[PDB]
Write a protein that binds this ligand. Sequence first.
Ligand code: HEM
Ligand code: HEM
Ligand code: HEM
Ligand code: HEM
Lengths: 306, 305, 306, 306, 305, 306
Amino acid sequence: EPEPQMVLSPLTSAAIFLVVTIDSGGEDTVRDLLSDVASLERAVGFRAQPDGRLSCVTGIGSEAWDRLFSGARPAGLHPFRELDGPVHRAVATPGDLLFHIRASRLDLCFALATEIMGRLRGAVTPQDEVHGFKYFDERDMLGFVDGTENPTGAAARRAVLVGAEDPAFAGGSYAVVQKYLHDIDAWEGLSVEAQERVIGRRKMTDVELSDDVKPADSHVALTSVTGPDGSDLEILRDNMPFGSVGREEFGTYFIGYARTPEVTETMLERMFLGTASAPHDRILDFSTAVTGSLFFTPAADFLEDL
Amino acid sequence: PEPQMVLSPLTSAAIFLVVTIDSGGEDTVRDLLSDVASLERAVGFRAQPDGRLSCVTGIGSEAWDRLFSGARPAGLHPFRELDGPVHRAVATPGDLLFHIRASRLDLCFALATEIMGRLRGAVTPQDEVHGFKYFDERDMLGFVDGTENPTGAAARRAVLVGAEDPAFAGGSYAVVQKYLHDIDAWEGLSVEAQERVIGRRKMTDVELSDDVKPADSHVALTSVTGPDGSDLEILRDNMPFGSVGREEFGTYFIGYARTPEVTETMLERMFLGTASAPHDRILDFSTAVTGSLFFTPAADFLEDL
Amino acid sequence: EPEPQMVLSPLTSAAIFLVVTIDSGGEDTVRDLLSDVASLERAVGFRAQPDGRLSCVTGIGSEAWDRLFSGARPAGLHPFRELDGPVHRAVATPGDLLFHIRASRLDLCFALATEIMGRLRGAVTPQDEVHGFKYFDERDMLGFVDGTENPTGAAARRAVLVGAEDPAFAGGSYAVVQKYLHDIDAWEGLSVEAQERVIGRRKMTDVELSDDVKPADSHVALTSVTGPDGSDLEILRDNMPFGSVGREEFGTYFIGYARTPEVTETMLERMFLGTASAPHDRILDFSTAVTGSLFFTPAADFLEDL
Amino acid sequence: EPEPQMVLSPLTSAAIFLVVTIDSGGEDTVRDLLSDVASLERAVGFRAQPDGRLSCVTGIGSEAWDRLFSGARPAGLHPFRELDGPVHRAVATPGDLLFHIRASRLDLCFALATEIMGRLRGAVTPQDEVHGFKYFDERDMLGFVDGTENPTGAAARRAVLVGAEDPAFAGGSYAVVQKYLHDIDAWEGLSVEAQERVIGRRKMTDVELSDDVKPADSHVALTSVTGPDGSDLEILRDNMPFGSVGREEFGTYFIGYARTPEVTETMLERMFLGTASAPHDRILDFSTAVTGSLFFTPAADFLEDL
Amino acid sequence: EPEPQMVLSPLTSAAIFLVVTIDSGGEDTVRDLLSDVASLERAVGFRAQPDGRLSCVTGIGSEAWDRLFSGARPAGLHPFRELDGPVHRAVATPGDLLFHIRASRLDLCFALATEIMGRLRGAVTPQDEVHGFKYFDERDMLGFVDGTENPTGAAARRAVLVGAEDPAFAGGSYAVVQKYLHDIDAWEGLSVEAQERVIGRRKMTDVELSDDVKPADSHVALTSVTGPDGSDLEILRDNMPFGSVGREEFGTYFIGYARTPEVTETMLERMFLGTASAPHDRILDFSTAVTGSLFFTPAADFLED
Amino acid sequence: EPEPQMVLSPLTSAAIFLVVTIDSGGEDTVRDLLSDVASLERAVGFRAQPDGRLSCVTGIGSEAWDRLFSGARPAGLHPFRELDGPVHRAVATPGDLLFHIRASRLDLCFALATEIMGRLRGAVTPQDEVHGFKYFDERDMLGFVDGTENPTGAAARRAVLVGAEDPAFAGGSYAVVQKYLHDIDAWEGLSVEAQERVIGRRKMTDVELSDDVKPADSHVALTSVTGPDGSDLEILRDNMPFGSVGREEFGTYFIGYARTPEVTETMLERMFLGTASAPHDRILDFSTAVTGSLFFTPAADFLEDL
Ligand code: HEM
Ligand code: HEM
Ligand code: HEM
Ligand code: HEM
């Protein structure tokens, strides 16, 4: 049977990330909205077809889940696990609801955000609002190509969607968000050769540096994990730059979907806390996490039925 | 004598950047103005011909006197505060304006980054607004915005300084105002009422006929005719912006004209009223929180320092 | 599955509706054309790909079915039922074949229509020919967004395609057509608030009116029907405006596909005859039906092989 | 230079030609519409920028000019001159006003036509209404590329716009329209080689046949006219196919702009009456003119001031 | 189980065909490249999305297969069979690897070909390099629409991909290539009506000639085969024109994918050797084959190891 | 004005450069072709509008000019000047005619080249044929953005077109071509910082290096010349990469247009021979010229009239 949310969206060039908390007594207003969210996507999005590609993914946090539903909980659902590393600190910030809104135009995102928060004023409190845009040729603020090794098609369905291991909630996924702020001054002080040492790929051509040469504290080194299974462990990311030139804010908004947060959380450990042969991900010497939240993004039919 | 890209094509994205010049920044600023033309190309060229990146640089009255000596543009002065019976148009600080436009936001942002990069230390940001086209050229009130702007030769004649101030021919006078709307209240009106506020039909964007159109409608108060009986026109490129988190919904107003007298007449009519109208009804749902006037020189004036 | 005809087309912006009757002796010429119709679709369409999105769906009436084939009939196939209501009359007009031709450009529709009518010169008599065009924001002639609540993906497959319940004809569907003409003068006499009360959605933003404000005689009210389960019964529509400014004709050409006509026919009863709560669909006070025909659109396999 | 109407439109893929006559007493209503016509173009067309390319060219006939205006007449303006040839007849049909409406989508045309006829209902009577569409590679109904040898840029400005030779009306132009209906059955009976002989260019590649192979009764031969000047005389054409497959109507709607009708009228004489070396244009053996009108399309400034 | 290579690519307008042989001792350098070829496709292609539509399909010859791997062989894999017909000769030329590289722009093909040949310098020897371009309305060098009756969606999956009949290599396909050169002078000597008799469809409208009037020596006649069960036998083609104006070379590069080569090879026998009804395909009277090679294009997983 | 050839073309992604010499007795066949070349451009190109952007610019060498025409010669027309530098050599190769064919798709270039070489079979001998392609972000074979500082609009008119100084040939221009091959192995051996020192701009962001830090042997340094007039001397370039991976050929085809060749030739002297402060342009340490030819590209009117 079950239809999931538009987690596997195509490439989109605009996004709004909205994270909010439920005030006391808001729970009823929110449950009403969750049943209608699908129909607002269509109201706003239908008229702009087919260029629009407007998609909203709604996610719910661990404490918010217990306030909203009783019954079963998704297996992997918990608050974000703060990581207090030797050097770098992955923080945990409040967040009950996520709207990850994507389209080919910002206005569509904004229109949907308007209608959603319109129904929710009274009942929630905004914690974070980010307007994200694609930079050139799928590049991020650091000037590297961002998204290349994401899984596609069949391999994406397999790495992202809950299946038979938690059959109650098949079609759902686990999203982790974290807002990063970069130290561009520092970063642009590096030679390109040295930047490529940090990331693990070539800047201009976006080719992976060979085993012969790729540092073990490079980002691509530390985020490549193999299972016990011997097969690679993959997640799906849709990192979006944001910023303001006035307030020297240059950002990467990280969002990572996985069929189980164990995967996402492992990559994070390796980045913040280190391996045997690496102190921490070099990327963090130019990037500070200022948020961190985890959510479960149910199947679409789950929300329909409220 | 070639002008700045004041007559840009339709673009879907913009950054408005307004700064003041710190004491001793005058030198760093003069350097940037000479190079601004060439940064436009650097950033923009590789995205052609979709890109449509354009930057227009404008200079305030007080800043002009700090940066150059010699003759001044005839019309250049600080934005005039309007203390109306009900509505007040404020004046906010602003030495430099960058009006950056393109078909993608990232192009605007990359140019804004490179400009503010050369000015970090010399200036202090007063205002930064990221604007976007809503839908089918609608604004935050739901009406089509731009329809009666002049085009081609009529725009050339309405926006560019000519023989009347020959020293500065190719320049223009930009007025900016950030407006915030009380959407709460606006969506409280029927559509028929909203049309009476604006002066056009919402969905079809046809003018209301002169026999039904109120004298306090926005379109009424912003149609001015001269002594010679011909229309007095400006060029606008209003951009919506906002934040749903802080229930901020806005229209960023920018209006270019060959003399500020024109732009300023429309404003007086809006804030202070006519015989037959207390004030523009659009202000009962829109608050001005900025106001600055700039002169946007011919391009050769900037190149040559 | 069997491969079905292109009933699930994307959004296309142009269409030709061609309805014909079969003359005496034309049976043979028609059978030949049905076998080749698939391959004419490709001839005409292939060189314009993928911008083109040319699709033709062919359907066959009740009486024509018996002239053309022997063997089983589709379970639901019958003449359109005239509905003689208190006020409004849904009429039944003759039609043996339907060609529902759709593309992103009118000329492609016209080239294929030319080739089809070219092979049927002698054999048939045209009853109806409409050239339709989508308004630029998916609006119809009344000014409302038209198609918003159509099913997509798996839900559409389930709503429109014959399955196991008549396994002989799996992949087929049941198309109902009606040409409507509108009294625009009257319609533009209403406030927008009133027009929204007729339709049941907001004009500009295309959001459903809330359950507590939506009239029982609104179009959206009378066309939402619930099944045995209490789950919604859906059809797939691709209404197209048409008209002529010279002869003050402004129209909406209605076409609805469903896996069984009982569904489409229920919606019609509710619209024309009324419920306890509602005299008739208020949309009919501004729209007159001047045609009405029912067709079965077979699986594509069924045409290929005879 | 004074501002002209949008005669020099880019390539556009849709059009509506509307021809009407002014009933008596209607002259006031028509003067009103002419002043506002410019601003209706923008009302409808603004919101669709920049894809829209909506443009309306308004033209006025000889008799209607005298009923409508104040003072002096455009030099070249007169009723269309019937041409009673040995074989073929170029007929003259009634027509006081022309709206030549063009865009990249048919709906935009229709919207503007609606708004225009809205202001005129009562005051005029429709004579002819054609909905035209380009084939996908600039082909006409005969299957040949159509538009190739039109002038561009400076050469077009010079060959179309009235200048100092009639300085009251500089910026205007002279349009000739004629609706043609083709005999497709006949035409498709020819070999391609023979079709090429009729037109004077190659069907597939659209290359001009070499000087010693191109018949003198070919269309391209008879419509190439040299001045006293020794230089070529040029017009600007935007021929649009139209038709109905039901009613076996296949058409080409001819519209031709020139700075003086002398040029257009010369091509017509050559076509219908013959030269020294040719009876008549072979294309007319497959094409019947069923209308014919001439109009003057003033400068835009002229219309604004009424 | 398996993800296949991008054999079912969308319509693309540019291609590079690259055919090489493996030098002695190159086996190792080649094996490394095959494991990484997937990830080079993404490197080069990702930043061009979604316009780019860059795809590479890699295939391996019969003799090369035995050099590179031990273990099972694909059931159908063998050297291209020469066909010495009464009149026309289908030749067999050397070729160990195939890269069938496709995109919307030529430069993307070229950047990937650069990266591939970069890792293979020293290990291989180029046999053939062709830069192809589709004409703007899907026509080929003879002026006819080329691709029309290719299978799509599920029917293509069924016609092209190895399934349960050799489950070891499911997801694979069999590619046959032939470079053809045309005698354009001769071809353009025909009336269109005659050309249609060679091909079996209408030139301009691309409609099949009716069964009664279509010659049995037309190209479409000889390449329609039915199986024993009476359902039609299909392949997937992506013919690309190429040439050089300077050296009067005008060509069609033929590539055909099928779930077994028996199918492709049958069509060839009919073309070169004839049926009862037909001496040979008339298209060969204007087209000469100057290459001929057969490859197995494995499932993508098989390369990743 | 007179109309010039399409020297000021928009951005195009594909090109064919064809250079030929005229055989004994070819002069007549060539004169015929030149009169028709404008009209072949339109034949081939018109049906592909507006995406096509097909343009062909035809140029004629010094010795060829005297075979083909008598009467005046263009002031600046002469054989390409060999420059035998201390280190690097700018060579002269033969060329009577140049066809500089540009469009958005290669096939359009090829179709026009085919039609042209078709009419010249027998009469000419090909000296060079190059199929060029722009990389997707306007980069060239060295990885840098190429075209940035080319003049546009009115400043280009002023830099490229012969005017009043040789009024007989106003509308013409002077094209110089050179085929370059690069030693990519060597080039990719540099750090990016070093490559930027060769070119004079930033690789990634395409920003000029500041006057304080830009080497005097950088390419941008040596090719900025100022006139007697005090203002900069500009040319118009449309460099195109080409190559073959089989024969390890990676190339840049150089073409430069100017209103007089003295401008183009000065830049070349500076590149190959050096200044006081520079031995030679560093770009030549990675690029070898293997052709060199100079042509005059006449006004379009000049060709039409033969
Ligand atoms: C500042 C935050 C980040 C930035 C700017 C960033 C940027 C990038 C870049 C440039 C790449 C290389 C291109 C690609 O393969 O997509 C990459 C790869 C990757 N990133 Fe990140 N990243 C960030 C954070 C994260 C985080 C927090 C995670 C995981 C929790 C993550 C997981 C991955 C993975 C798995 C890969 C691919 C591994 C493979 O080569 O097989 N990234 N990221
Ligand atoms: C406060 C937010 C504003 C909004 C949302 C707004 C919106 C609009 C709209 C919808 C129109 C009709 C469509 C069009 O002609 O563009 C319009 C017309 C106009 N507006 Fe505004 N406007 C604003 C502020 C201003 C200001 C401050 C000025 C001048 C100082 C101005 C000057 C004009 C002019 C000159 C016209 C056209 C008059 C004509 O139709 O002949 N607007 N505006
Ligand atoms: C049924 C009506 C017509 C059809 C189907 C038609 C079709 C064509 C075609 C295929 C061409 C060649 C391609 C081109 O240059 O556009 C052409 C050229 C032309 N037609 Fe027509 N045409 C028609 C009527 C007319 C009429 C009524 C006129 C003038 C009164 C006209 C004037 C021309 C001119 C001037 C040319 C090009 C001259 C040159 O090649 O230098 N056509 N027409
Ligand atoms: C050999 C291969 C060549 C390559 C790869 C090449 C590449 C470039 C690049 C990357 C730029 C900087 C961006 C730009 O402004 O376009 C440039 C600028 C330029 N090149 Fe070249 N070029 C080559 C040969 C030549 C030759 C032979 C000439 C002149 C004969 C020339 C004249 C210029 C000029 C005049 C400029 C810009 C001057 C200014 O910045 O004010 N180039 N070229």
